[PDB]
Amino acid sequence: ASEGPALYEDPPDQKTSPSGKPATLKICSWNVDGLRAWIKKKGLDWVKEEAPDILCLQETKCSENKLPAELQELPGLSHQYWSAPSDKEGYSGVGLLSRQAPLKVSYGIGDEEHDQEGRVIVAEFDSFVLVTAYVPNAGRGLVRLEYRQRWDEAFRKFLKGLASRKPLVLCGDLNVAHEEIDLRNPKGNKKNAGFTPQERQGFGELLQAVPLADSFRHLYPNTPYAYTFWTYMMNARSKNVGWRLDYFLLSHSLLPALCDSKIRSKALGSDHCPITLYLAL
Ligand SMILES: [Mn+2]
């Protein structure tokens, strides 16, 4: 095609806040493209090396009653919560695994229409509430784009609610590359899922309304070729022809506790790579 390799090297982990406070929380989020495939691909061994405090997973494709038994070889993340489509089938699904149990775990966004596909887990902790999300793809041919706009609004209002109570951290596959810098080929994707003006706009609305800051882009406003997903086809990863779909968005109040927002480009196991957040809470 038009694209050859574009180099990207994630900078070293900055593990102290701007006030010099060492990070006390490490959160890892990962679209795993199937819990069972991911595990087969050694996803868990990378999790152990990373040693996060909280691990959030998206697209587990796994019924909450058919969890791989390997998920018990994680003694460090022993508190495990799962949401999968209410029809009990093998698609979508998210996970949240935690060293410490949260004060409370909830599922969905309190909207029946939007709560049947196991897309959202809310884990409330002392100083903050963590949400992980697997946002509805707009669909091939954009046949799900109208629903996705419904989804975007409900979700945006629900999050706005949470944040009014506690500092918010939202992470996961938000199924949109916000701006042109967020994907390798903006020009050819303006009509495809992930880069419609509708989706880009909803991400923008999400940021101002809650409000939320894009942790990675706040720290690296001018850094290009930083992606978290590459299609399996066309040898895309190897050419770094990708999209940034995975994010950590923070309440502005958490910005002084932001140490770094990382993209683990080399970590294999899915068509997305892990992202990792360091906070000094
Ligand atoms: Mn997938």
Side-chain angles (χ1 to χ4, degrees):
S2 174
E3 309 78 41
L7 312 182
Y8 178 71
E9 196 59 20
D10 208 38
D13 293 2
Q14 170 61 217
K15 302 189 218 185
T16 33
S17 75
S19 85
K21 182 175 190 184
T24 52
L25 180 66
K26 195 177 170 164
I27 303 173
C28 185
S29 185
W30 200 345
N31 180 313
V32 296
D33 194 39
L35 208 49
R36 232 154 215 121
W38 180 65
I39 285 180
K40 261 189 278 187
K41 299 194 164 156
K42 310 315 159 192
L44 299 160
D45 294 317
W46 183 92
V47 168
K48 283 175 179 172
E49 177 65 359
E50 184 72 336
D53 295 298
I54 304 179
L55 172 75
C56 301
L57 304 179
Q58 303 85 37
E59 211 180 307
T60 58
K61 297 185 167 173
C62 193
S63 161
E64 317 169 17
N65 289 332
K66 290 180 183 180
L67 292 170
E70 290 88 350
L71 282 173
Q72 309 169 19
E73 187 77 348
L74 289 171
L77 299 161
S78 71
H79 299 94
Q80 309 179 3
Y81 314 92
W82 306 94
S83 194
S86 82
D87 61 56
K88 305 180 298 170
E89 288 282 322
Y91 69 117
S92 195
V94 294
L96 195 150
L97 302 78
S98 197
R99 176 176 53 84
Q100 307 183 131
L103 305 186
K104 179 181 73 190
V105 173
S106 299
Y107 304 118
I109 77 190
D111 202 337
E112 200 187 55
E113 181 202 0
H114 301 301
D115 285 346
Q116 310 303 330
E117 305 185 312
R119 296 178 175 285
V120 166
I121 295 177
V122 186
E124 171 170 350
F125 295 99
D126 284 346
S127 65
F128 76 118
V129 48
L130 167 65
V131 181
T132 192
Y134 178 56
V135 167
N137 192 278
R140 56 174 174 265
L142 308 176
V143 291
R144 277 265 280 190
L145 182 63
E146 184 50 39
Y147 173 76
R148 167 65 184 275
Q149 292 183 275
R150 276 178 277 155
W151 165 275
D152 281 354
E153 169 170 353
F155 195 42
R156 165 174 83 247
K157 296 174 166 197
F158 163 78
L159 294 175
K160 199 189 184 98
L162 296 183
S164 77
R165 281 175 277 161
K166 273 182 175 176
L168 169 68
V169 170
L170 166 71
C171 73
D173 184 347
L174 307 186
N175 263 313
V176 61
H178 179 205
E179 295 289 355
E180 279 201 334
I181 187 168
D182 295 304
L183 77 172
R184 188 64 189 285
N185 187 5
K187 263 62 78 181
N189 285 293
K190 279 179 273 196
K191 305 193 63 175
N192 288 338
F195 204 60
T196 66
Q198 282 85 349
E199 290 163 301
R200 300 175 62 192
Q201 208 55 48
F203 190 91
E205 300 167 352
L206 173 62
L207 297 185
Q208 75 172 90
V210 173
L212 289 166
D214 182 333
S215 65
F216 178 89
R217 203 50 80 187
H218 162 91
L219 295 173
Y220 311 102
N222 309 313
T223 300
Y225 317 134
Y227 313 130
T228 63
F229 159 79
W230 309 261
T231 178
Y232 272 133
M233 305 286 303
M234 303 158 204
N235 207 216
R237 192 151 183 180
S238 71
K239 290 175 292 165
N240 193 19
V241 180
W243 303 53
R244 196 171 61 108
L245 304 176
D246 301 277
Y247 298 79
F248 284 100
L249 311 187
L250 310 178
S251 286
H252 294 162
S253 56
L254 289 182
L255 288 172
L258 177 63
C259 301
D260 204 341
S261 182
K262 320 301 306 157
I263 295 162
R264 305 312 202 183
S265 316
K266 314 163 197 180
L268 305 175
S270 167
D271 53 352
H272 294 238
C273 69
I275 52 169
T276 295
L277 186 76
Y278 288 88
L279 292 191
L281 289 175

